[PDB]
Design a protein around this nucleic acid. Sequence first.
DNA 1: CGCTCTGCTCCTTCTCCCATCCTCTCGATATGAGATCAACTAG
RNA 2: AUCGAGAGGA
DNA 3: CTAGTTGATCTCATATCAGGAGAAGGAGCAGAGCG
Lengths: 49, 50
Amino acid sequence: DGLKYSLATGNWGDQKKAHQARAGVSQVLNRLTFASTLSHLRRLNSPIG
Amino acid sequence: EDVKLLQFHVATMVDNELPGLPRAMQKSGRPLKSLKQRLKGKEGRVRGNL
DNA sequence: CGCTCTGCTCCTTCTCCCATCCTCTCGATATGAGATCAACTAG
RNA sequence: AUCGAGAGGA
DNA sequence: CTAGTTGATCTCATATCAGGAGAAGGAGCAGAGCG
């Protein structure tokens, strides 16, 4: 359930400390077109805010 | 101790963003929405609904 | 000359704020017995 | 339905 | 008058880092001023 929750919601951390956890990890794969999918699989994020 | 707990509950009912104090929590760590937060600012009662 | 009365700057705390509007998806979120009373429900 | 999150549009 | 039946209601009991800005308080020092 820990792995399932983190991958399902994108909150990297325990379900109880969801406010503390960083969000936006583990997004839903974009399937509008093939290029969209490829770009989504090669995406980088700066957690700056 | 029970007086302290009652004071905490009342205060967090009115204001749940007090610096230093613990946050009143619903479940799964979700903090309660206090009366002050209903009116505070953007999307609040005044700016958001009047 | 001791003692007080400000008062002056300064560091600390703390509290506040951070464009508008719109669309979508996705995950999580008991039961009865006894007592009291009051309305009957009749004698 | 509510809350949050995310992705988007101008 | 006057007891018996009918509903509602309450109690009680049973387990197991890459913010910032400004205003208010307190602190310590410095001196002035008068007993």
